Every structure is written in C-alpha cells, then in structure tokens.
Amino acid sequence: TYNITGDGNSFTPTSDMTSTAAPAIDLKPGVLNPTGKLWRPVGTSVATIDSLAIVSDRFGQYSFVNEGMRETFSKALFDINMWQPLFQATKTGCGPIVLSSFTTTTSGYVGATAGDALDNPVTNGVFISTVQIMNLQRTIAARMRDVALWQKHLDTAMTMLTPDISAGSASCNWKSLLAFAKDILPLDNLCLTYPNEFYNVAIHRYPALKPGNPDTKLPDAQAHPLGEVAGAFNAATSEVGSLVGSSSTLSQAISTMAGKDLDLIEADTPLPVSVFTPSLAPRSYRPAFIKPEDAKWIAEFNNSSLIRKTLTYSGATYTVQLGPGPTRVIDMNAMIDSVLTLDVSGTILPYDTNPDLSTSVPAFVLIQTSVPIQQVTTAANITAITVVSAAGASAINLAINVRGQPRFNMLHLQATFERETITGIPYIYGLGTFLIPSPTSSSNFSNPTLMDGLLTVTPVLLRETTYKGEVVDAIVPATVMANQTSEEVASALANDAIVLVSNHLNKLANVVGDAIPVASRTDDSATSAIVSRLAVQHKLSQVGQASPTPPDYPLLWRRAKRAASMFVSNPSLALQVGIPVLTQSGMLSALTSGVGTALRTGSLGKGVTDASEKLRARQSLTVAKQAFFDQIGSLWPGK
Amino acid sequence: TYNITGDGNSFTPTSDMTSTAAPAIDLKPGVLNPTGKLWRPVGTSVATIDSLAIVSDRFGQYSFVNEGMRETFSKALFDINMWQPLFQATKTGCGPIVLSSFTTTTSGYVGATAGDALDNPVTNGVFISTVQIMNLQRTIAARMRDVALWQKHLDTAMTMLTPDISAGSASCNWKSLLAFAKDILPLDNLCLTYPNEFYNVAIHRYPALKPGNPDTKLPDAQAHPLGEVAGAFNAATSEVGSLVGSSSTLSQAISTMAGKDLDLIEADTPLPVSVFTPSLAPRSYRPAFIKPEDAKWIAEFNNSSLIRKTLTYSGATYTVQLGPGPTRVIDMNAMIDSVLTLDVSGTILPYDTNPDLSTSVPAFVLIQTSVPIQQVTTAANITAITVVSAAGASAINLAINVRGQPRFNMLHLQATFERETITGIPYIYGLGTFLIPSPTSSSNFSNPTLMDGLLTVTPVLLRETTYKGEVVDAIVPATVMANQTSEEVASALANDAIVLVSNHLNKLANVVGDAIPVASRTDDSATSAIVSRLAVQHKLSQVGQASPTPPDYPLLWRRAKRAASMFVSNPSLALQVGIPVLTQSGMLSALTSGVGTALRTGSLGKGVTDASEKLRARQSLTVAKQAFFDQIGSLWPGK
Structure with a gap:
C-alpha cells in the first residue's frame, strides 16, 4: 500500500467506469439446483446397477455441485477479499476461505431419482455437504456483518462529493477534493481513522480513481481490477442509453404480458371468474342524483303516493312520507354479497319546523316485500319495513350547529347484505332516512326524505363476479364491448366485469408507453397491428365505383394513432359506448396480441429525439458538476 | 460434545470446587520486565566485546523474554480455548494463537545497559517484537470483546439458581434444576440458543458440575481441568476460613503500616509538615457558646464598655452596641491562611422593636487595630472597622416569617483571610452581626449583637501545619500528648497536629481490629507490647517494703486490654488529657512498633470462637439452600 496523502492522483469519473460492486446475488430456488445427487451400486461391485444408495450425506459426499453456484459463490468470496488488508x-x-477446499470429490452415479441415476455414472467429480455449506455460509454472513459499518462509511465519502459521472467524463484536482473532504468530514467517521485503507479499497472498486503518489512516475493505469466489464454495459453508447436498462425494461413488460396470459380479452362465451378476477376493492356510490334508469341495483320510488305516518318503534312514530324522489331504493335483490357501508356526513337537514330536532337520526331501512315498489301505495303493502341501520336510534346535535350550519357529524352505517339471509322471494329493497321515534308532523314536514350522502358498497364476496346484474361464473370481455355507457360503468358494482378488464388493460397500456414510442407524436411501425385490422375492415365495396379510399397506409394509420392514443390516455374508453374504431374488439385483440411480438423481435427501440436530448442534458449536467468542483477548488484548493 | 438433555448429570456444588476462572491478570509495570535486552559485539567477530549494538528492534530481535510473562500470557490464551468449539x-x-510461535530466537549478549550487557552473552534464547506483541494483544483483546456477551450470559445462569456452595456441599437433581431453568429462563438469552455449548463450557469451568448422559455409565469424574488447584485454596479448612483471605488481609495491613512509615508517632523535636501531613479538609466551628479561654483563634470581648453608634455606610448608621458577650472576636492574627466561610441560617432575630427590620443583614466585620481588644472602649480606638462580609448590604425578609418564625434563609459569607494582606502589625480581628444602613435605635436595641450561626474555616494553605497556634514547619506528635483538652481539640484549626495524628492513628486501629483479636473480650498475647512497657514502668520501689504488686501479668495485662480497647473505640483519646495509662507516649510507641512484628511473624490468627461460629452458620445456610432447591424440585420436578 501507498501513502494516500500524495501527488499524482487522478479524479476521473467516467461513464465507462460507473461505480459498481457486488451488492446482491441471485439466489432463486430454481437456480440453486444443478443437479444430480451422487449414488452407488448398493455398495458391492459392478452388478448391482439396478440398485442405488446415496453417498454419504452423513457428513460429506453429496450431489454434483452447481457449476453456476460455484462460480457465483467464489465471486462473492472476492468481495471480502477486496478488503483483505483491512x-x-x-x-x-x-x-x-478458498471455497474450492469445500468442493470435495464425489465418485459414482449422477441422477435426480434412483430411476434416472441408475443410468448415469460420473466418476470423480465434486460435492458439498449440508454441514459444510452451513459453516461456509456462516463465515460469509459474518464477514458481511463485519463490513456493515465499513460499507456505510465508504458510501458516505462517495456521496459527500459524489464521484459519479453517469454520462461522459469529469475531471478535477483530487488533491483539492481530498483536502476539502478532510477539512469538512466528520471526525467520528471511520474514514478518518482508516484513510489509507478506505482509499485503497475505493481505488480497487472505482477504476475511476487513482492512487496518490505511489510512483509519481506512474500513479495512473488503464487496467484496474475486474470491475470494468460490468461497467461497459452501464455506459452510454451511440444509439442507446443503457443496455441493461432497455433489456430489463422490456423483459418486465413481457413478464407482465405473461402473467396476464393475453387470451383474457378474447372471451365471448364463459370464462371463469376465478381465472379472470384478481383482487377486488369496495366502491363508493351516491343516492342523490344517481340515475334509476341506468343503475341496476339502485333505482327510485316515483312521485305520487304518500306513505306518511308509519310506526317505527314502540309506540313511537316517523313520517317516512313517501313521494317526490324519496332518496333511493337500493335494489339488493340477489345482487351478490356486499356490506352496505353508508357514509353519512354533512347531511342532516333538520325537520322543516318541528321540535323533533332532537331524536332524529340518519338511518337505513331495508324493505322486504313481494309487492314490487311501484305497487307500494299504502302501509298495507309494505310487508316488512325493517330499520336495520341506525345504532342508537334517538339523536343528538352532531351537526355543526353553532354557526347556523346543519352539518351532520360523520357516521358509519352497516347493513350486512347477505342475500342468503333472505334468499330472495320477498324481493329486497332499502332506503335512506332521518328516522325518528319522536313523532313527526306529516302536515308540516311534507318532504318524504332527504338523506343524501355516500353509499360505499363493500363487495365482500370476491366469489363469482357479476356480468351486468347477471350473477355469473363467467367474465366475458369481448361481449362487454359497446354495451356500456359512462353512467353504467360508474354505477356498476365493484364485482363487475368492466373494472376488471380495465385493470388488465391498464397493464397493456403500461407496456405500450414504456416500450413502444407512442409518446409525443411519434408514429412508429409498431402501431401496425391496429392499422392492419382497419385496412381489411374498410372493404366497403359496392357496384361500379366502390369506396375511393387512397390506400389505408397514410389515412387509417393516422386515424389509428389517434385512437390508440385515446386508449392510452384513458383505458376505460374501450368499454365505453360510441368510440369510433375501438368499438371493434378485433382491433383490441390485435393490439393485445400484437404487442408481444413487438417486444419479442423488436430491435431495441431508442427514440431518436430522446437520444439527442438525453445526450444534451447529460452534457450540461457534467458541465455544472465541473463548475461545482471548480468552486470547491476555489474555496479549498487542497494541496 | 454431549447432548445436554440427558441423565446422569450431578449437581454438586462444593467448597472444594468454588467457582473460579481467570477474571484479570497482574500487569504491573515493575512486573513486566525480566529483563536483559539482547545485543551484539558491534557486528564483527569475537573481538569487539567492548562495544554492543542492540539486535533488530527494527522488526524482530528484542530482549530476553519474561519467563513469568510467557507463562502468564499462555494461560490467558487458555481462557479463550475454553470456548474453542464456540x-x-x-x-x-x-x-x-500459539504464543510460542511469537517467542523467537535471540542470540548474543544479555543486559540492561551496554555496560552490564558487555559482560554477559546468552546464546540462542528468545525475544518478542513490539510489532508482534501489538498484533498478539490485538487478537487477545478482540477475543475478549467477542466473548463479552457470552460471559454475561454464562453468569446469569450461574446466578439464576446459583451453584455456589462456599461451605461444604450441596446436592439436588440437576435435571430438575435444568428443566425449571428452561421453563423459567428468558427466551432472548444466548443460553437458550446455545444450550449445548454453554453447558459444556460450564462443565469445563465448574468441576462442581457434570455432563448430562454422555456415557450414563460414567457421566461423573474426579479429574476435571486445571481449576481444582486454585479451588483448594479458597476452600475452608479445619483451622482457617480462607488461606488467600487471611494472607491478603494481613498483607494489606502491613502495607498500610509501610505507607505510614511508623516512625511518625515518635516525634518530639521538629518533623517536617510536608512529610507528616497528607490531605486536609475544612472544619466547622461556632461563635455561640465557644470558650474564649480555650480557643486560640476565637475569643470574646467582655461585658462593659458600650460602643453603640458607629457610622457604617454613607451617612448611614448601625449600632454595633458592644457590651454583654457580643458574638465572638475572631482572632485571625497570623493564624495560617484560611477562608472564613460563614454559614448563617436560622438566626436573624429582628431588632427588638425597630422599623429597621428591613435593611438588616447578617454580616462579618474584620477589626484592624493596634489597640488590643480589651483596650477598645470608644470609637477612637477602633482604627479600622471594615465591613467585609455582607454582599448586598441592605435587607429582605429571608426569614420564614409567615408563621411568626424568625428563620433566616441560608447565607454563604466569605472572608479571604490572607494574612499577607495585612502582614500583622495592626492585629487582626473580626466580628459577626446583623449590620444596618438604616439607623438603629441604641436606646431601644440594647443588645450588642446576636448573630449566632456557623463559621466554617477553610484552611486553604495546606502549607506548613500549625502546632497549637504555633505556625511551624514541624509536626511533633509525642509532645502533643497530654497537652490537649477535649475542648481544645474541638476548637483547634483544621491545620493542626492533633487531627493529623488521629488520622494516622485510625489506620493503626484498623489494622489492630481486623488482624489482631481484640474483639469481644479476647485477651491475646498479641497485646503484650503495652503490658511490657507497663510492667517496667511500675517499678515503684521505696525503702523496705516496696509496692507489693502481685506480678504484672494478670494485673496490668487486664488494665492494659481495657485501655487498648478504649484506644480502639475512639482514637482521639490518645490526644486527650487525663487518660490513665495512654498518657504515656512510650506505650503508644510500643503499640505502633509492636503491631508490625505481630503481623510479620504471627501464626495466622484464627479466633476459635469465630471458627465454630462460621462453621455453624455455614452449615445452616447450606441446609436452607438444600431446602430451597427442594422446593424447586417440588414445583418443577424437571425430568
């Protein structure tokens, strides 16, 4: 080792030499194997081939060692070696350690099963023992935990004036840098106790850095350790940023495609719930101004009838007062299994002018009658009005009443909507209302009721997702197409085909944006899948002079970017009625499939625009870093 | 190693086998040496004997190795070895490590100085290098710091049901013990992760303990490691408790005698301050009821005179009112160097009935006149009344006045009594008083003054201790004898012979009580020193029939225990006038000297009484431990 406090030492951070170590290694189970355990012909001579017993697992002679694992592991040991003097x-x-010592001779048969192993004998190779690996690992782990302080400290240095030029090349007086470091750095650092070691190590890791003055003749070199290799791959080229990058990126895209299993979209006729549906969340809907026409599970009673005074409790009365748009009728007649999470806040709106101000609560009432709502004109009809959701069903001024406000405190109501509880038959309804024991003046409070907040359906039963009111074991994407209005989608239960599809579709989009250059106005050949479907579809031929469409290739191509772009910008549009060309599921199947091939055999897509731009930005960064260092040079021209 | 969770394992704590390890070793500088550095006859052949150069300190060949240090150090290494498997x-x-490898051949001359070394050549011995010891130590230290957690954990076990029978022998089911341990012990312990090791180690250290079931045949042995040896010396014998004990104890007594240097007491004619005096502390005296007759530095003015109104401040007046026992006159006329730390609390006693209640402070005033106090009858006399000690010299009701009380808050006054400030000549006095600016009615407040609290003399000048007012470079113990009343002693400055002597005398006493059996009525031959002086002194012969004293040996012997005992019970009595036989300094010299011989060739004094008693108590302890374990056996009969 060399005196660190010498002259000649280069501070050359280059893209070529991007910091790297071995942070972590691959230890996937799959990857652990290679392969065959070593066995023997009973134990007697060359006869018993029919029979094998495993070698001495007892304390030694195990399997044929993992070539890759050996190679890997030895590498790992080299990390520690980087700090040997320390x-x-x-x-x-x-x-x-010398791993090699552990890798001990095994001689006999090689195979996975006795079966297989019978056939194959492999003389005088190598095994490793459970015990041995135990104790080897033990050592390595220990080594690591001994370095854990060092690593940190090393890192701090490396960031406290960061030697990292990711793009191109920087240079400044290392001396200058070094001395300001030692003028600014905390005394309590390990770096200040161990200058000489840390620097040595640094130099051994960072080819970007040179020793002090060891031979001021030659302080600098071009050959450093192994590092280099890995560095070249992180260094920016003529046509690409990072090789590893784009490779990884694309591979992540593939594997997400893989996991989606594509096919998903091309489903007309029953595709099973379980298969299509991942994990589901609750959704939030309103009474208020929802639309009875569109909303399967939530409609309204219609103005004109008037069911005013109904007994609610023991000799206690409330006017439900049924007429002009009375909140909403929640149609929970075999609408999967949910928890009607009613989230009331704001809304209280005190009775018109009744001293029934106290004793009036936000409540939920289920209605349980074989008389369909439009028939429900008198008390007689109701069968069952069951007040489900109120808890302490009196009242207190929870409303922010001080300043005139009739804001109602946030309540959490629950109605365990389990259709099994009733099993249909007296078809299931529910309403929302400020229900009272203390009798309300019907003449006075002419309003039926205006309990308008939130209704957060909890679709508990992730079993069996609904296709548009239809409780089915089937999720059929392609038929969902063009059969949904924005309203419908919004309205729809959490448990419904639509959202599930979009979630899957969002992953497709993700892929497309990151990988394919569908960014600011770049029409790429990649986009060809949709256009090919468009092109053939446009064969609107009549008699004589058919459709005189100057070939599809400019025309439809541009139209098709436009609509791709719309898909990309909002994935749900795919499910939304009246979308020019996406309404044709063919084109969505085409895109879906199309992408994968595009990833597969794509000659690593690096947008010309972006290249130049990255180049430029990168350079300017380096400039300002230089200028920073310069300022540092100025303020303490270290030696 | 053996499965710990087996049967056959003994739980036999014995006196014989008293836990021990190697907690620390001797590393005294003195002790490091042995000895001669190794040298060479310049470097040429056998001619240059006249000249030696030290061997290669450079990186190797050093001194002849410390035989003891080798032996010691190797032992130390064995501690670590006790945990080798772990x-x-x-x-x-x-x-x-193998220390031996470090101990490398040195061949040539042996000596301390070139001088000495010239004479002595010692071929092919051994050295150790600075460097080497550096790195060796480094290792050992590291080892230790690795074990630091283990040690602790091991200890916890060993106390959590303590296997320590210091006296005799105990036995109980180890199994029982062990299982309750593992049923009660904290999970977070290292002991529960490492059962097998800890136990092994334990067994290796504690011969008192046997392995599980290793061969249930033979789980037990009588030969253990080295331990044993050391243990036998801590084990109680037929006539003594502990051999090490008594040996140590006595040696501590000697060395304290050594440090006192005996001679100290036998000093009539000037023995130098510095020599006799160690470290000194402040003392606390009172005005109040101290006695002018006895108290050298603190006397009183005498009733009848009346110096009432004296100007105290700028056109501001206080009646010092000098007459009937006015506090005290502190006679600080060349009374060494002190800080008159006046500690007033309680005492305020408000003016008789003057609206001069406010503006009256506890103060100190020094009086600086060539007119001796008894001559001081009018204002004219005073020369100087200097108010020294008041600080903010007005007042506030610091007295706990609420409940009628006239308790004055605790004040800290300071008067830097440096006799150099004045250098005698206008002889130095001081008084204590509630001094006012706001004029006090002399007719009214007829009391002179009653400022009675504490006066904590700070004898700063540990230079030159006073013999009874006489500021001398001499401390003469033997002449101090019989020239001090209890009063005088109490009164005496901190800086005075008396207390110093007692402090020394207290160490003699300490020795005597711990070592010589001058405990509950045991007259021992040891006490013979005093009696032999007594015996010869009693030679009261007249004419004819001289003193018919039935020989000294019962008579004087018993009288002399009595007076020894009185010395022991209070050391100061030696300095106190009128003590029957101790008044004779001869006897104190005799005791002083006497003891050392008595320690020296004493056949290790173990009082018969105490032996039996220790035996008995010890046994009963063991009994109850047995009974405890028994209860533990009961509550969880572990396997």
Missing part, C-alpha cells in the same frame, strides 16, 4: 488489520478471521 | 462455530477467527 480485515487482517481488524483481526477478524480474515483468512481467505 | 468460537469456531461463531467463525470468529478461533484458531488458537
């Missing part, structure tokens, strides 16, 4: 100095069992 | 398992550089 370990040694710390007296912390430094002695380089 | 170290190894922890992967913590376990590999047993």
Whole structure:
C-alpha cells in the first residue's frame, strides 16, 4: 500500500467506469439446483446397477455441485477479499476461505431419482455437504456483518462529493477534493481513522480513481481490477442509453404480458371468474342524483303516493312520507354479497319546523316485500319495513350547529347484505332516512326524505363476479364491448366485469408507453397491428365505383394513432359506448396480441429525439458538476 | 460434545470446587520486565566485546523474554480455548494463537545497559517484537470483546439458581434444576440458543458440575481441568476460613503500616509538615457558646464598655452596641491562611422593636487595630472597622416569617483571610452581626449583637501545619500528648497536629481490629507490647517494703486490654488529657512498633470462637439452600 496523502492522483469519473460492486446475488430456488445427487451400486461391485444408495450425506459426499453456484459463490468470496488488508488489520478471521477446499470429490452415479441415476455414472467429480455449506455460509454472513459499518462509511465519502459521472467524463484536482473532504468530514467517521485503507479499497472498486503518489512516475493505469466489464454495459453508447436498462425494461413488460396470459380479452362465451378476477376493492356510490334508469341495483320510488305516518318503534312514530324522489331504493335483490357501508356526513337537514330536532337520526331501512315498489301505495303493502341501520336510534346535535350550519357529524352505517339471509322471494329493497321515534308532523314536514350522502358498497364476496346484474361464473370481455355507457360503468358494482378488464388493460397500456414510442407524436411501425385490422375492415365495396379510399397506409394509420392514443390516455374508453374504431374488439385483440411480438423481435427501440436530448442534458449536467468542483477548488484548493 | 438433555448429570456444588476462572491478570509495570535486552559485539567477530549494538528492534530481535510473562500470557490464551468449539462455530477467527510461535530466537549478549550487557552473552534464547506483541494483544483483546456477551450470559445462569456452595456441599437433581431453568429462563438469552455449548463450557469451568448422559455409565469424574488447584485454596479448612483471605488481609495491613512509615508517632523535636501531613479538609466551628479561654483563634470581648453608634455606610448608621458577650472576636492574627466561610441560617432575630427590620443583614466585620481588644472602649480606638462580609448590604425578609418564625434563609459569607494582606502589625480581628444602613435605635436595641450561626474555616494553605497556634514547619506528635483538652481539640484549626495524628492513628486501629483479636473480650498475647512497657514502668520501689504488686501479668495485662480497647473505640483519646495509662507516649510507641512484628511473624490468627461460629452458620445456610432447591424440585420436578 501507498501513502494516500500524495501527488499524482487522478479524479476521473467516467461513464465507462460507473461505480459498481457486488451488492446482491441471485439466489432463486430454481437456480440453486444443478443437479444430480451422487449414488452407488448398493455398495458391492459392478452388478448391482439396478440398485442405488446415496453417498454419504452423513457428513460429506453429496450431489454434483452447481457449476453456476460455484462460480457465483467464489465471486462473492472476492468481495471480502477486496478488503483483505483491512480485515487482517481488524483481526477478524480474515483468512481467505478458498471455497474450492469445500468442493470435495464425489465418485459414482449422477441422477435426480434412483430411476434416472441408475443410468448415469460420473466418476470423480465434486460435492458439498449440508454441514459444510452451513459453516461456509456462516463465515460469509459474518464477514458481511463485519463490513456493515465499513460499507456505510465508504458510501458516505462517495456521496459527500459524489464521484459519479453517469454520462461522459469529469475531471478535477483530487488533491483539492481530498483536502476539502478532510477539512469538512466528520471526525467520528471511520474514514478518518482508516484513510489509507478506505482509499485503497475505493481505488480497487472505482477504476475511476487513482492512487496518490505511489510512483509519481506512474500513479495512473488503464487496467484496474475486474470491475470494468460490468461497467461497459452501464455506459452510454451511440444509439442507446443503457443496455441493461432497455433489456430489463422490456423483459418486465413481457413478464407482465405473461402473467396476464393475453387470451383474457378474447372471451365471448364463459370464462371463469376465478381465472379472470384478481383482487377486488369496495366502491363508493351516491343516492342523490344517481340515475334509476341506468343503475341496476339502485333505482327510485316515483312521485305520487304518500306513505306518511308509519310506526317505527314502540309506540313511537316517523313520517317516512313517501313521494317526490324519496332518496333511493337500493335494489339488493340477489345482487351478490356486499356490506352496505353508508357514509353519512354533512347531511342532516333538520325537520322543516318541528321540535323533533332532537331524536332524529340518519338511518337505513331495508324493505322486504313481494309487492314490487311501484305497487307500494299504502302501509298495507309494505310487508316488512325493517330499520336495520341506525345504532342508537334517538339523536343528538352532531351537526355543526353553532354557526347556523346543519352539518351532520360523520357516521358509519352497516347493513350486512347477505342475500342468503333472505334468499330472495320477498324481493329486497332499502332506503335512506332521518328516522325518528319522536313523532313527526306529516302536515308540516311534507318532504318524504332527504338523506343524501355516500353509499360505499363493500363487495365482500370476491366469489363469482357479476356480468351486468347477471350473477355469473363467467367474465366475458369481448361481449362487454359497446354495451356500456359512462353512467353504467360508474354505477356498476365493484364485482363487475368492466373494472376488471380495465385493470388488465391498464397493464397493456403500461407496456405500450414504456416500450413502444407512442409518446409525443411519434408514429412508429409498431402501431401496425391496429392499422392492419382497419385496412381489411374498410372493404366497403359496392357496384361500379366502390369506396375511393387512397390506400389505408397514410389515412387509417393516422386515424389509428389517434385512437390508440385515446386508449392510452384513458383505458376505460374501450368499454365505453360510441368510440369510433375501438368499438371493434378485433382491433383490441390485435393490439393485445400484437404487442408481444413487438417486444419479442423488436430491435431495441431508442427514440431518436430522446437520444439527442438525453445526450444534451447529460452534457450540461457534467458541465455544472465541473463548475461545482471548480468552486470547491476555489474555496479549498487542497494541496 | 454431549447432548445436554440427558441423565446422569450431578449437581454438586462444593467448597472444594468454588467457582473460579481467570477474571484479570497482574500487569504491573515493575512486573513486566525480566529483563536483559539482547545485543551484539558491534557486528564483527569475537573481538569487539567492548562495544554492543542492540539486535533488530527494527522488526524482530528484542530482549530476553519474561519467563513469568510467557507463562502468564499462555494461560490467558487458555481462557479463550475454553470456548474453542464456540468460537469456531461463531467463525470468529478461533484458531488458537500459539504464543510460542511469537517467542523467537535471540542470540548474543544479555543486559540492561551496554555496560552490564558487555559482560554477559546468552546464546540462542528468545525475544518478542513490539510489532508482534501489538498484533498478539490485538487478537487477545478482540477475543475478549467477542466473548463479552457470552460471559454475561454464562453468569446469569450461574446466578439464576446459583451453584455456589462456599461451605461444604450441596446436592439436588440437576435435571430438575435444568428443566425449571428452561421453563423459567428468558427466551432472548444466548443460553437458550446455545444450550449445548454453554453447558459444556460450564462443565469445563465448574468441576462442581457434570455432563448430562454422555456415557450414563460414567457421566461423573474426579479429574476435571486445571481449576481444582486454585479451588483448594479458597476452600475452608479445619483451622482457617480462607488461606488467600487471611494472607491478603494481613498483607494489606502491613502495607498500610509501610505507607505510614511508623516512625511518625515518635516525634518530639521538629518533623517536617510536608512529610507528616497528607490531605486536609475544612472544619466547622461556632461563635455561640465557644470558650474564649480555650480557643486560640476565637475569643470574646467582655461585658462593659458600650460602643453603640458607629457610622457604617454613607451617612448611614448601625449600632454595633458592644457590651454583654457580643458574638465572638475572631482572632485571625497570623493564624495560617484560611477562608472564613460563614454559614448563617436560622438566626436573624429582628431588632427588638425597630422599623429597621428591613435593611438588616447578617454580616462579618474584620477589626484592624493596634489597640488590643480589651483596650477598645470608644470609637477612637477602633482604627479600622471594615465591613467585609455582607454582599448586598441592605435587607429582605429571608426569614420564614409567615408563621411568626424568625428563620433566616441560608447565607454563604466569605472572608479571604490572607494574612499577607495585612502582614500583622495592626492585629487582626473580626466580628459577626446583623449590620444596618438604616439607623438603629441604641436606646431601644440594647443588645450588642446576636448573630449566632456557623463559621466554617477553610484552611486553604495546606502549607506548613500549625502546632497549637504555633505556625511551624514541624509536626511533633509525642509532645502533643497530654497537652490537649477535649475542648481544645474541638476548637483547634483544621491545620493542626492533633487531627493529623488521629488520622494516622485510625489506620493503626484498623489494622489492630481486623488482624489482631481484640474483639469481644479476647485477651491475646498479641497485646503484650503495652503490658511490657507497663510492667517496667511500675517499678515503684521505696525503702523496705516496696509496692507489693502481685506480678504484672494478670494485673496490668487486664488494665492494659481495657485501655487498648478504649484506644480502639475512639482514637482521639490518645490526644486527650487525663487518660490513665495512654498518657504515656512510650506505650503508644510500643503499640505502633509492636503491631508490625505481630503481623510479620504471627501464626495466622484464627479466633476459635469465630471458627465454630462460621462453621455453624455455614452449615445452616447450606441446609436452607438444600431446602430451597427442594422446593424447586417440588414445583418443577424437571425430568
């Protein structure tokens, strides 16, 4: 080792030399194997081939060692080796392990099963023991936990004036840098106790950095350790940013395609719930101004009838007062299994002018009658009015009443909508209302009722997702197409085909944006899948002079970017009625499939625009870094 | 190693087997040496004997190694070895050092100085290098700091049901113990992760304990490791408790005698201050009812004179009112150097009935006149009344006045009594008083003054301790004898012979009580020193029939225990006038000297009484421990 406090030392951070170490390694189970355990012909001579017993698992002779695992593991040991002089100095069992010693001869048969192994004998290879690996690992782990302080400290240095030029090249007086470091750095650092080691290590890791003055002749070199190799791959090229990058990126896209299993979209006729549906969340709907026409599970009673005074409790009365748009009728007649999470706040609106101000609560009432709502004109009809959701059913001024306001405190109501509880038959309804025991003046409070907040359906039963009111074991995307208005979608239960499809469709979009250059106005060949479907579809031929469409290739191509772009910008549009060309499921199937091939055999898409731009920005960054260092040079021209 | 969770394992704590390890070793500088550094005859052949150069300190060849240090150090290494299987398992550089490897050949001349070394050549011995010891130590330290958690954990076990029978022998089901341990012990312990190791170690340290079931045949043994040896010396014998004990104890007594240097007491004619005096502390005296006759530095003015109105401040007046026992006159006329730390609390006693209640403070006034106090009858006399000690010299009701009380808050006054400030000549006095600016009615407040609290003399000048007012470079113990009343002693300045002597005398006493059996009525031959002086002194012969004293040996012997006992019970009595036989300094010299011989060649004094008693108590302890374990056996009969 060399005196760190010398002259000649380069501070050359380059893109070429992008910091790297070995942070973590691959340890996937799958990856652990290669492969065959070693066996023997009973134990007697060359006869018993029919029979094998495993070698001495007892304390040694195990399987044929994982070529990759050996190679990997040895590498790992080299990390520690990077700090050998320091370990040694710390007296912390430094002695380089030599993995090879552990990898001991195994001689006989190679195979996974006795079966297979019978056939194959492999003389004088190598095994490793459970015990041995135990103790080997033990060591490595220990080594790591000994370095855990060091690593941190090393890192701090490396950031406290960061030697990282990710793009191109920077240079400044290392001396200058170094001395300001030691003028600014916290005394309590390990770096200040161990300058010499840390720097040595740094130099050994960062080819970007050179030793002090060791031979001021030659402080600098071009050959450093292994590092280099890995660095070249992170360094920006003529046509691409990062090779690893784009490769990874694309591979993540694939694997998400993989997991979606594509096919998903091309489903007319029953595709099973379980298969299509992942994980589901609650949704929030309103009474208020929802639309009875559109909303399957939530409609309204109609103006004109008047069911005013109904007994609500023991000799206690409330006017439900049924007429002009009385909140909403929640149609929970076999509408899967949910929890009617009613979230009332704001809305109280005190009775007109009744001293029934006290004792009036926000409530939920289910109505349980074989008399369809439009028939329900008198008390007789009702069968069952069951007040379900009120809890302490009196009242207190929870409304922010001080300043005139009739804001009602946030309540959480629950109605366990389990259709099994009733099992249909007296078809299931529910209403929302400020229900009282203390009798309300019907003549006075002419309003039926105006309990208008939130209704957060909790679709508990992730079992069996609904296709448009139809409680089915089927999710059929392609037929969902063009059969949904925005209103309908919004209205729809959480448990419904539509949202599920969009969730899947959002992953397709994700892929497309990141991988395919459908960014600011770049029409790419990639987009060809949709156009090919469009092109053939447009064969509107009549008699004589058919459709005189100057070939599809400009025309439809541009139209098709436009509509792709609309898909991308909002995925739900796919499900939304009246969308020019996406209404044709063919084109969506075409896109879906299309992409995968496009990833597959795509010659790594690097947008010309973006390249230049990244180049430029990168350069300017470097400039300002230079200028920073310069300022640092100025303020403490370290030696 | 053996399964700990087996049968056959003994739980036999014995006196014989008193836990021990190697907690710390001797590393006294003195002790580091042995000895001669190794040198060479310049470097040429056998001619240059006249000249030596030290061998290669450079990186190796140093001194002849410390025989003791080698032996010691190797032992130390063995501590770590006690945990070798565990170290190894922890992967913590376990590999047993082998000190011997470090101890490398040195061949040539042996000596301390070139001088000495010239004469002595010692071929092919051994050295150790600075560097080497550096790195060796480093290892050992590291080892220790690795075990620091283990040690603790081991200890906890060993106390959580303590296997320590210091006296005799105990036995109980180890199984029982063990299982209750593991049923009660904290999960977070290292003991519960490492059962097998800890137990092994335990067994290796504690011969008192046997392995589980290793061969249930033979789980038990009588040969354990080295331990044993050390244990036998801590084990109680037929005539003594502990051999180490009594040996140590006595040696501590000697060395305190050593440090006192005996001679101290036998000093008539000037023995130098510095020599006799160690470290000194402040003392606390009262005005109040101290006695002018006895108290050198603190006397009183005498009733009848009346110096009432004296100007105290700028056109502001206080009646010092000098007559009937006015506090005290502190005679600080060349009475060494002190800080007159006046500690007033309680005492305020408001003016008789003057609206001069406000503006009256507890103060100190020094009086600086060549007119001796008894001559001081009018204002003219005073020369100087200097109000020294008041600080904010007005007043506030600091007295706990609410409940009628006239308790004055605790004040801290200071008068830097540096006799150099004045250098005698206008002889130095001081008084204590509630001094006012706001004029006090002399006719009214007829009392002179009653400022009676504490006066804590701070004898700052540990230079030159006073013998009875006489500021001398001499401390003469033997002449102090019989020239001090209890009053005088109490009165005496901190800086005075008397207390110093007692402090020394207290160490003699300490020795005597711990070592010599001058406890509950045991007259021992040891006491013979005093009697032999007594015996010869009693030679009261006249004419004819001289003193018919039935020989000294019962008579004087008993009288002399009595008076020894009185000395022991209070050391100061030695300095106190009128003590029958101790008044003779001869006897104190005799005791002083006497003791040392008595320690020296005493056949290790173990009082018969105490032996039996210790035996008995010890046994009964063991009994109840047995009974405890028994209860533990009961509550969880572990396997």
